[PDB]
């Protein structure tokens, strides 16, 4: 009956900031920031339960050579460590063909 999801985010200082009590908090409390309160607003509208996590590779990361096998942040979606990504990540067809994307939230 119940369901939960895992979220990917990144500690980019404009978008996510490490709260001073960083020793022992959970990712749903470890963090604040534009991505964090955007995610909170999205969950406020959509109602789903979630947990925030950093990208486990901790980086954008490159394509695997001659294979384009995905980096950590994309692989955590495609290989089920997470089910949604809410991060400063560039829209491109070379990614859209592999995974779906929302409407952009900013233009830059």
């Amino acid at each position: 009956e119940q369901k939960t999801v895992v979220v990917t985010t990144i500690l980019e200082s404009p978008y996510v900031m490490m709260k001073k009590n960083h020793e022992m908090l959970e990712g749903n409390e470890r963090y604040e920031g534009y991505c964090v309160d955007l995610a909170a607003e999205i969950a406020k509208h959509c109602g789903f339960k979630y947990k925030l996590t950093i990208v486990g590779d901790g980086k954008y990361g490159a394509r695997d050579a001659d294979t384009k096998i995905w980096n950590g942040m994309v692989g955590e979606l495609v290989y089920g460590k997470a089910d949604i990504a809410i991060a400063p990540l560039t829209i491109t067809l070379v990614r859209e063909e592999v995974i779906d994307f929302s409407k952009p939230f900013m233009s830059l």
Partner: protein, 54 residues
């Protein structure tokens, strides 16, 4: 804005691109968050966040 103010832009920037939320193919979560993003996009709440964080 993060002091020391010893860095600066020059030139009129290079391109225009979007940032958005993403979701793997077939995941049910996709459209019910996409509609929420549309809600925020039309309600303009993002302007509060931009003010708060820049």
């Amino acid at each position: 804005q993060r002091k020391p103010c010893d860095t600066m832009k020059v030139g009129g920037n290079l391109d225009s691109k979007g940032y958005g939320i993403a979701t793997p193919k077939g995941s049910s979560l996709g459209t019910p968050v996409n509609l929420a993003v549309l809600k925020l996009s039309e309600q303009g709440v993002l302007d509060k966040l931009k003010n708060k964080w820049w």
